[model samples]
Target: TRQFLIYNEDHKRCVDAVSPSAVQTAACNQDAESQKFRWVSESQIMSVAFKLCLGVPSKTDWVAITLYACDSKSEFQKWECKNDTLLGIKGEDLFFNYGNRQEKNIMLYKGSGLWSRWKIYGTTDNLCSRGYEAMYTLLGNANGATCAFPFKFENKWYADCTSAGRSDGWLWCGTTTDYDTDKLFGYCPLKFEGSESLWNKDPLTSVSYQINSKSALTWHQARKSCQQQNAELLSITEIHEQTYLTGLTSSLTSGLWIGLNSLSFNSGWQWSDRSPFRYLNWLPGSPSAEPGKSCVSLNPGKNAKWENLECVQKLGYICKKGNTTLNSFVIPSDVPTHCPSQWWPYAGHCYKIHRDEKKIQRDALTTCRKEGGDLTSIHTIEELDFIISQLGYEPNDELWIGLNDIKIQMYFEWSDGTPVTFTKWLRGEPSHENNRQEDCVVMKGKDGYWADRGCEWPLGYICKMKSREKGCRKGWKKHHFYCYMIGHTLSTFAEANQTCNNENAYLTTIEDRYEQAFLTSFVGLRPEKYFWTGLSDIQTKGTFQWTIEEEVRFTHWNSDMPGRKPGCVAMRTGIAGGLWDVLKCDEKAKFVCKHWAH
Candidate 1:
């Protein structure tokens, strides 16, 4: 059976720091003196008997002892025990039963070959176990029949241990050191390039002008205007000459004045003295009159041929000149005109029938009125046939004419209020085919006759009016109330206004429906975008009032538009709906100005 004992000596030493919390003492029973084993004092124990009967015999018989130091928080209680045999030790068996455990407190001991070899296993509340184990192993074999255990380290023990050069098991120490130096770091860099250019190497090399006066003038006055600009009135001698002048006048608003006028006896059409009619440039069925009309002008309305008109009638002019420095040329003397009758020297006057562009016949008439002209009127067969010859002769190649059946419902009248007296219908023409929507009349090219068409159909056009009075030459075309002046390159609306102001006049404004319709047809103003005009709703927000205050008259608003966004207005010649609408003020557009010609 195992014996158990509680010893306060080991417990107090462990709690207060002396002996381990658990210690084992095993005595041998070789000497049978039971009284030799007894408690010495309250904190110490002494063993005098050797209980050897339990195991091996006398001389070699030994008791294996084991110690354990319990942590304060350990589950098992620390106790003391004594046994007679190594195999029967109670605490020793308990240590094995509990398996592995960790020591939480510091351990101390002395004596060793190397300090590293003096290890404190389990616990070291007392230094005796660890110190004795190490010292006894180092001191060689036991000396007497009874061995004496050693105590804590003493000076004599050190002298006895030093003789063998201190055993070499576990005596080592470590330290740290320092040094000084320097180092460096680095990176890379970047680069770049440039741009290129874009410029025209060769551009157009020639320039020419188109006549724009409303009345025709004598050959001499037209020549004088051209000479003033160091150019000459147009004199076409070759196809190139014709092409050059045609290109210049293609977009013109009025017929161009040329050098040819009444010079033959009794007024006959001829070119300047230097050039003759080698090209037969007269429009088809042209030069109808014998003599009365002698002046000549480029009638873009009639195959762009030379037309015989009265020298006194107002008409546009064309000029041409060359420049060697820039390998270019310019012709800048022509101006637009609005001629009146009595000044119509020729029997047949050139008139453009407004079509395709946005203006109605009424609006076209109004524009002609503002320019001192009227919607074109076709009188003689020569003029009529010539106009027909130039029309595009496709299936629906019908073009707008100055005639309309507005008055008598079936009878047509010219913009000048002249009745359509003469008739030039092809076979069975004017049958009023589909006449319900055919109130408007246009010249048909396929059969070369006039046909009534829809009034709103956009087509090229013509306008007719009497010529201006004689000796009535303004800087450009002459008019009863105004004169047009030319000086600079095309400019923005604001700049054009400033230029007109500098001339002591404001830009021309539409005063009535007549002026509006005429300008609309002749200039071809469409409502989609704005053109530069003399009017602006500058002072009043959304109050679009014309500069002339000509009654809140003519209007041409695009469908659902002419929205409040725009604040200014302008005109474009050759659009479908000839009217005025708002536009951004800063936008660029060509402009026309009016000045009082005293």
Candidate 2:
């Protein structure tokens, strides 16, 4: 007897039909017909029909049936069934099974074979038959599963079967394994090899002087004094050394003996060390060696020159050798190990916050000094750009940097020992408007300009101090001042003093031990040379006082030098000896001045 059987969609009957090998082979096929179907369709009508033939059938006589018909309504149609031995019949006819007993093999194998090649007979509305084309498309190429099909059954079929495999490989398409080694262009460190070395050798040492016991000596005996110290009389070979000696004795008029001498005119001049003279001199009118005299001595009456003497005249002499005191070296302090949090690193250094807050320029300087840094010093164009970037070009937001013309016009400098190399001068600005009286500077945000203002005007300012390792204290130099005019000569002592007074200062004063020591060590005094000092008995005949009153509180005088007869004191220039003399107040000399807040 012929029968039909239906299976539920959830039924799990064909447990051994799906194989991993089949699935893998199906994935590689380029044609849909060659692809193996792994799972039954989910739609009720389609799932039931497909699984019934493939699943274990209940009765031996039952068989799977499929109808293949054309679109035109006609009597002719195709039908397939395993009713009698895998039979395929044509023509639309009602099935009439006359009592026939089918074996179990016939039901299971024959039924499955008939349904395997069956095509549904119906229009597109038939749910069980739909999605065949879509299924084939997805199976042909893994990517075809993304196509949007009008049939819901076809879309769902492809999504379930192909999504996982396609996504895994597609996701890794453009990934790379080498990310860390890439670098952007133009952002690398520069390699510096450094520049040529300077000819800075140790200075000559063990310079000793001798007092001639007899009247004078020939050039030979003068050379003997220098030889005793393993040195020759001063014979300048380089322009720098000559300039140094010239500066050393600029104020002195008395001629001192150098190593150069014309002991024998015919032989030409030579140094005590017997080096032939490359630089020669005869003063303005000197070395008048009248044949009879064949000796050389420095005549105090003439400018630095060698004069012919009778080898018996007593005079003072100088000698020089290598110095060993310079061996006592001190190491420079180390840089600060810690910095304040508010400071930020820029251009290999740290900078504190530069903001708009009202303060006087000097007061700002004091504040910066207290913070162990100063208003920034713009040393290069890059440094200037860096600072400008930090402060951006904002409207109405000017912040003062450490630059001003407090004592001199248009001479701007940083609070730290930095010089100004760039300027942001707005058009028609810094007119020096009333600058002669209003001695100050301010930065304007309107046009990023710097302008001079009154020192009393309140404005935002920057302060700076040396780095911590420098051991710089929080106070300004006590005797520091600036001169007003450039290359303006003050011909006489009285004129220089008056110029100093006009600027609210006086000729520089030597007050305490430190000041005296500094002068003796770095600022030497030569005999008969003159430089004006604050000390003078101008006011009272015998009472000496510093022009800058505070310095006179301390004093150092050589036994009887400030005696009543000497009314004015002038520091000698050039010679390294601590020798100063009180001169007549009327003597003309150049002077220095000091200025400070009134």
Candidate 3:
């Protein structure tokens, strides 16, 4: 049986479901809030704090995923792992026991039969050793044949299970203990242990931001200070969270020490909390595998991409500790203005059902991906139910799904390559009518499920719109109608220009002095930092031109000359009041980018 330790990423606490009278995240004890839990799902997660899974709560587009509860109606708790889709693919995408990577050697004992080993409750003050009178007490009426439950949380697990032969050592309780008074180790009313003053509710996301500005600290110190606030370093997930944290610092060269680090060049960089790593926005060339450089920092600059720094680099840090709300946090990509009104939003995926049907598997896939995504991969009962209800089932109309193995000779794969963790197959599905060539999946239902069929078989499939499709890609800063982002990375003129073009922007072309001033101010006044501008004389000697091939009109030239001859122009400082000079096209320099708003 699997369970979850739902830690609030923002509040440095867990939404415990261990006890009935739970309290939120703290040191040891309270109600059962962060301390007590039973795996559950649906609205049970939201109402778990209120202790009810009996009815439906409000359903909105706002989707929040916490831990699930064990529904008596449904045999066990169901949490989709690997972020799978309904009938998607298979893989485990869950973390437990704090994702402790340093798993020590555990020797399981089977001498006493090893029937069960788990906790039921706890004691506090970190006194796991001082027990005996404070430990297990047997039930007055010992049970005949009952369940064994653990009631403790340990620093490490799977050690020797000793009872000291005390008080009918194996005595069992047949029912839920109403009021446990046993002074077991680390057990008591949950103790909430964070400084209320350092953290506050983030108005935009409802997450608690534990701000620390007393002094900038090294990566190590920053991490420790977060603990002082009774929290951990912020584990940035969405662009909005980064945007909010950026507002906390005013530096062209400094920022927060969020949770990310690499052990070595071969060890991939990962978050400290070890939550699923879904979203990433690294600065141009970062996470550099330079031997001693392993820690990551949320740099304060245009675009504000993450960068790897030395472990001891001093920077202010933000401590996060709450699970208010974070879903739907992406800034609406500047997608076409009409798509939102045209599509329906549910569980972070926007979708539309195509009334027209197509049976050709190749065309169906190309068409779906062309519209924005692969065949829709339903993951949850709610997502499955909602889409089915919204696009009612035709008595005989079955839709194509993102499941198929046609691409690789009957080797299974989802449309988007999304792993299928939870399945809703029609009982031993994927039936091959014509000797196993049936590689595609199709379905029609009041609730969602899929069936296998030949790729030649035709049926319309649901197209899930791809989220985060090309809207400034997360961290660009807006200046008037134009958005400007600077890459504080070294790049040659061609590389810089190509990077800009790839990101939907052009090598910055300054039209007037005011715009030049804005660009200058935005990139800051670094005397040694030269940057690339669109002005270059690559076509003809002494004939500088912008990306539009327009002649250089506004002038900011270094009287030292167009200096090196017909090459590329760059922003430089020093020599004769100008920040412009011509350098070889191969020379590298930091660059700026510009694009207009939709």
Residue 14, candidate 2: how far off, in angstroms? 99
How accurate locally, in lDDT, is each candidate? 0.41, 0.39, 0.50
Residue by residue across 336-410, what tens digits does model 1's lDDT show? 344343222222343444444646545655665676666666543334433433322233455555677565443
lDDT of 2: 0.39
Instruction: Put down candidate 3 lDDT per residue, 1-598, tens digits, no spaces.
Output: 1222334232344434333322223543544443444323321222333333211111221122233332434322232222111110012222122212232211112122111112223322111122111111111222111111222222211111223323534322222212143322211111223224336667887778755443356777666655544467777765577677666554444466777766423224455554323244566555454668777787776455677788886665666776543222122223332345456655456777776767576778788788777777754333554455444345366888787766554345667877543335553243343355547777754234566677786677777865452344456655446777778668899999988998888888877554554454444334444778899877666677888665566876764757447788887632111267788889888788888875
Would you estimate the TM-scores of all the predictions? 0.26, 0.22, 0.27
Worst 10 residues of 3 by lDDT: 81-90
Error of 1 at 124 (Å): 87
Best by lDDT: 3
TM-score for model 2? 0.22
Judging by lDDT, tell me the better candidate of 1 and 3: 3
lDDT of 2 by residue, 356-420 (tens): 56776677777777777776554432333333333333436555676665544334445576544
Q: What does the lDDT read for residue 105 in candidate 1?
A: 23
